[model samples]
Target: GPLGSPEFSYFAKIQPHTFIEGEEIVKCSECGNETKVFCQECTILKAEVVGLCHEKDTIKCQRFHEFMDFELDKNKEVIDKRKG
Candidate 1:
């Protein structure tokens, strides 16, 4: 596992996170709506990165809708099927 040994990424900018919260409702980083969902970027990337987007299906905010386009769309399809 030397240089470029396929062990890890070199210029990898993509970041992952685990959603964490308490009983308090949070606000949307994109739309500024009082929501429970938030991006860990603001929570982990930095202390003052600001709020995230509302991830609720009925009120998906701008960041959430566009950040993971395919992921969001696929989930919407599943929700549609489940509802229908």
Candidate 2:
């Protein structure tokens, strides 16, 4: 039964530690691209296909990199001030 209440009546026939289930992981705030952590490399490659940080590319990689750093610094300042 694909859909059932008890779900897998025969439990003794199960294997040991051999399970493969996909799980959501990384998420891009700008594009909302939610994907599993295992797909990290693949996702970055796709971004490169769209000319991400490539020669003369305008994917905002440079600016966004700086912006991310700025955000990190800003947050750090706030945290440091709170601690001090």
Candidate 3:
């Protein structure tokens, strides 16, 4: 229902607190990979794929770990900037 009519927003606080009812397909701006939930602070397309709006695996692990920081550390020279 378009991120839906707030009926399932509770999931944001419940077990695993994240829910998607449909194919919320998206792309990772960093590695140019497939992912969901775009990061508002940046164009990560979910730089963290651990379960908190994160997915995919690039660079085996080096880039993978880099993205984890990319999810929050949106100020470093790791991957792009907010709007330099």
Candidate 4:
């Protein structure tokens, strides 16, 4: 292969997590109830930098959703047809 071979590169800017002064339950705005909660890792991206989530999600927290997405993406084709 050549020195400059074909390769896929994915980059994302993750913001730094600040110290949480206190802990509080994140309530869902749509359901008017608490669906999910997050801790220090609950941060966002803005202008190629990490931005702390000073807000909440109406559904599940970003941590849970991101984990689910990563796991699903990591899986390869299997023999079980129902799995896919």
Error of 2 at 14 (Å): 48
Count clashing residue pairs per candidate.
Answer: 2, 0, 3, 1
Return the clash pairs for model 3, or none: 48-54, 49-54, 49-55
Reference-based TM-score of each model: 0.28, 0.24, 0.22, 0.20
Query: What lDDT score belongs to each candidate, Candidate 1 first?
Result: 0.47, 0.35, 0.42, 0.40
C-alpha lDDT of residue 79 in model 2? 29
List pairs with backbone clashes in candidate 2.
none
Q: Higher TM-score: candidate 2 or 4? A: 2
For model 1, residues 1-84, the per-residue Cα lDDT tens digits are 465457566654544554444334666554666656545554555453234443543355544534643442323333223343
What are the per-residue Cα lDDT tens digits for candidate 4 across 4-84?
Answer: 545756845555543242344444434455333433443433222222233333235445435533534544666444445
Q: What is the lDDT, from 0 to 100, of the residue 31 in candidate 2?
A: 42
Between candidates 3 and 4, the one scoring higher on lDDT is 3
Judged by lDDT against the true structure, how good is candidate 2?
0.35
Using TM-score as the measure, the top candidate is: 1
The runs of at least 3 residues in candidate 1 whose Cα sits more than 4 Å from the true structure, single-residue gaps closed, are 1-15, 27-34, 53-84
| Candidate 2, residue 73: lDDT | 36
Across 15-49, the per-residue lDDT of candidate 3 in tens digits comes to 32233322456554555555555333333345433
* Best-to-worst ranking by TM-score: 1, 2, 3, 4
**Candidate 4 lDDT (Cα, 0 to 1):** 0.40
Best of the two (1, 2) by lDDT:
1
* Candidate 3 TM-score versus the reference: 0.22
